[PDB]
Amino acid sequence: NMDVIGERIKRIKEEHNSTWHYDDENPYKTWAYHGSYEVKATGSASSMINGVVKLLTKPWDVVPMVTQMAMTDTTPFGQQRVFKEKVDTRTPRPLPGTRKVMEITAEWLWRTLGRNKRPRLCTREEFTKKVRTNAADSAKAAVEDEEFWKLVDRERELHKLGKCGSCVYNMSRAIWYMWLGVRYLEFEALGFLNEDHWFSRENSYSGVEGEGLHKLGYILRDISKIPGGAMYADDTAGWDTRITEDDLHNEEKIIQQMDPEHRQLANAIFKLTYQNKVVKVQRPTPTGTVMDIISRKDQRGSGQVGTYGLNTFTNMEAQLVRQMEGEGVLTKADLENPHLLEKKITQWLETKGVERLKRMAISGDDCVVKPIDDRFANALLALNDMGKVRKDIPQWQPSKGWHDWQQVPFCSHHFHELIMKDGRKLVVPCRPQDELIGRARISQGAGWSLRETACLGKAYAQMWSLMYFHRRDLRLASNAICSAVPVHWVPTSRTTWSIHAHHQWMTTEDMLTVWNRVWIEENPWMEDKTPVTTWENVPYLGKREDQWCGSLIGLTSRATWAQNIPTAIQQVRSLIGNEEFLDYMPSMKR
């Protein structure tokens, strides 16, 4: 293991030799520990509160889920216990027949994914353009510095020699340059999966990359039309910690489709930073805070570029294998058998494969599968053997499915079919409201002006206008926030890091115009392109469903809040100053 990780540890060791030691009382049981060095503590036990949002969402001040979200630990104290709970585990090795099935499925899945697209290297100017269009943190400063690009080249020359000196995953400007450069190199070799949308629904069949939250519901409604059993959506208990050495080696087969110069750099990312890794993790001690140097040959680093794609790939593979078991193609005897017949797996993949991929919606560890029947509910031998053990359910207890696509959980959401006042149907995203309000009430970090705060608030308000307008409490709170925040202030900072977010709310353009573009114009499932002229024609969930999904509708405190909301708007306005404000409350029934 050391002839791959040695150089990186050697560099950390030399750089921090002042405080470098072997802390014999380290908590690593499954990870190989190398040593520690003293550092300053990072993060907090709490989260900064967005006063603009809080002042306009008073009934949620006394709501447990909302209070819970204001917390979330990021200190070495919080970092160490979260690591213990899942990261410090070992997945047993899948059986020889399981390993063969995964291999046959991996090979076929990669050829299917690359039937039209061809892998390619990603560039310095692609990364640069991305870093620029993200902020508009000190990554823009590094990208602008030619000295950063020089280290990148030095590291790349080591990678071409099959060596690694600075690619360390984290749980002066020199170390920041080494991190952003490690991320650039991985972006260079594996970014094409994201940048050239390999997991789009059109290229992957099961995939949903680049579709967006507003489309996921319509995708599930279309899967519901496919004849078969119920729709299954099983969560995996810590997916990234369940990525085996066999998963990594199967994921690596993509290098076969690459040009020699691309294959060489991609092989370097896989072999040196995925199938081997050097990790940095903050740990508190009775004599301060230390940064530990750990390593392992398996599991997925959640921060990395290829994480979404390679998780989508392995889940598609895992679900195809579970479908084969459901159909009686794979038996218990087959999974135990090294010499299992490749023929029947190839026969099933070449005749039923694509059709079987079309029965699924897969986004990283999130899957929705509509098998040909319900034998799938009890097809658990391979899923458990592959290491993809379902969360909070006895290992051999049959999976429970849904016969209504609207009850199906996918990507922290459920989806509703709404009938508009004109009779047209919408399929909308939904989640418990407390999670939405609770998240909007969190401002990111310290040293933030009221201006930056009001703009983040405006961003959350407009995201709600576009994605969650059907939630009565959120349309009101959204209008209230947009009334309290000056009209020309541009929503700045992201509301989410979600791959399903396309941030159409990050504008000063009229939200009803934007709504019409997303839900009517650009909506492939909206045949009638007649615009909606008024927010009064933009539908809500039925009162019942709105209440079932967390609404305070019908409560006194909520009616009080709704009644006295111009007072709170005025309070926020007076504190902001003599700016230009537009009153968005008239756009509502009140």
Ligand SMILES: O=C(O)Cc1cc(CC(=O)O)cc(-c2cccs2)c1
């Ligand atoms: O159901 C609709 O179509 C009308 C509608 C809209 C709204 C939204 C707003 O607050 O202006 C709220 C309510 C309710 C507040 C208390 C009980 S029901 C009803």
Ligand SMILES: O=C(O)Cc1cc(CC(=O)O)cc(-c2cccs2)c1
């Ligand atoms: O990616 C996920 O797992 C699901 C998810 C989660 C969240 C919450 C968060 O990231 O803070 C927000 C969203 C979005 C809100 C609008 C468009 S996408 C989606």
Ligand SMILES: [Zn+2]
């Ligand atoms: Zn490296």
Ligand SMILES: [Zn+2]
């Ligand atoms: Zn709902």
